[PDB]
Write a protein that binds this ligand. Structure first.
Ligand SMILES: CC(C)CN(C[C@H](O)[C@H](CC1CCCCC1)NC(=O)[C@H](Cc1c[nH]c[nH+]1)NC(=O)[C@H](Cc1ccccc1)NC(=O)OC(C)(C)C)C(=O)N[C@@H](CCCC[NH3+])C(=O)N[C@@H](Cc1ccccc1)C(=O)O
Length: 330
């Protein structure tokens, strides 16, 4: 079996991408944020405290003939950004882009933090990290990808994120029409439960490639590209008028600028992020100042190849027994 689904940015900034998913019988369509940095599938539901739901479409398990209560099971999760949610757990049929899994754990939110309440476009998350991070207890539940692997034509799923445009998530096949050249695979460490890999180095604009190991994780659920302080410092040094701003919380610069491109190694291959991808947006509508798409990882504790990096590539999440990450230009 295979699935193919369109993923669309939630706004003009590509802050995040939502992908419709069908849950229950008959099917209830919710727009979820596919998150390779976590492993919970959770949704806004009939069970979420009313004052906390805010324009989102909710999942009503009592209207699904195929839902069953996982009795005893609860969950609770917090994200890097400080947001959180908790509740209990159903199994139900879940479909993405025509790929159907039965007995998928669907985590139903009883409460949600203010961030998700204010996010009208996101009805919940679909986690695509390794199942070891799942927060359901007392027994952890498999991700949608893990449950799917038995029936997939190939145990993989590709992320094809658009620059200010829709993209695709594919399950179980690689669309050779989607990228240029060849896919370069690199080893993944599952020690911390992430899609964790090591970049072979970097270049800024048209200058020299520096071989230096950058350990980071591929996270579709993080907007920006967070690299070590001295790499980020090297990038913004090539932009006049760029400066670090305490008040905004990162490197800012004139919207006027043409930004240099940024290159990062994957084994012997090179992926080039066009400069315009790194120009995130004005810090406020009508400002001369724009927020940089590359920022320091120092405060986060881990390098993150987030959406600004990933949408410059075709990315293959190879979830064979011994996982690997594939990158191609597109
Ligand atoms: C550690 C990273 C790589 C993985 N991760 C991050 C998620 O992918 C998570 C997915 C989001 C959550 C919010 C809603 C949309 C989906 N991403 C994030 O939390 C990042 C973090 C970040 C970095 N810098 C500034 N913010 N959020 C973002 O990148 C948001 C996305 C967004 C889009 C639209 C609207 C709102 C928010 N974008 C954003 O802020 O953009 C601007 C900076 C321009 C404002 C996790 O949350 N993982 C959990 C797994 C939980 C498993 C529990 N068993 C975790 O480790 N949580 C840790 C937190 C942590 C880890 C490591 C170090 C420190 C803290 C914990 O236990 O608390």
């Amino acid at each position: 079996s295979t699935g193919s689904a369109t993923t669309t940015p939630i706004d003009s900034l590509d802050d995040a991408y939502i992908t419709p998913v069908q849950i229950g019988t008959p099917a209830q369509t919710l727009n979820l944020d596919f998150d390779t940095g976590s492993s919970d599938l959770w949704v806004f539901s009939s069970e979420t405290t009313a004052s906390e739901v805010d324009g989102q479409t909710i999942y009503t398990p009592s209207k699904s003939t195929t839902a069953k209560l996982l009795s005893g099971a609860t969950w609770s999760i917090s994200y890097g950004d400080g947001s959180s949610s908790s509740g209990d757990v159903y199994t139900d049929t879940v479909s993405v882009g025509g790929l159907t899994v039965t007995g998928q754990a669907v985590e139903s939110a009883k409460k949600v933090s203010s961030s998700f309440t204010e996010d009208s476009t996101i009805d919940g998350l679909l986690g695509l990290a390794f199942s070891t991070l799942n927060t359901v207890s007392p027994t952890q539940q498999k991700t949608f990808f893990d449950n799917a692997k038995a029936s997939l034509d190939s145990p993989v799923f590709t992320a094809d994120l658009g620059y200010h445009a829709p993209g695709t998530y594919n399950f179980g096949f690689i669309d050779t029409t989607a990228y240029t050249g060849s896919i370069t695979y690199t080893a993944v460490s599952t020690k911390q439960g992430f899609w964790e890999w090591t970049s072979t180095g970097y270049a800024v604009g048209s200058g020299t490639f520096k071989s230096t190991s950058i350990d980071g994780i591929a996270d579709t659920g993080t907007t920006l590209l967070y690299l070590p302080a001295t790499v980020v410092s090297a990038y913004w040094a090539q932009v006049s008028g760029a400066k670090s701003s305490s008040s905004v919380g990162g490197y800012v610069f004139p919207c006027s600028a043409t930004l240099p491109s940024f290159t990062f190694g994957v084994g012997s291959a090179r992926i080039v992020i066009p400069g315009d991808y790194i120009d995130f947006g004005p810090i406020s509508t009508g400002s001369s100042s724009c927020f940089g798409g590359i920022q320091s990882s120092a405060g986060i504790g881990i390098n993150i190849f987030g959406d600004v990096a990933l949408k410059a590539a075709f990315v293959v999440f190879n979830g064979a027994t011994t996982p690997t990450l594939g990158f191609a230009s597109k």
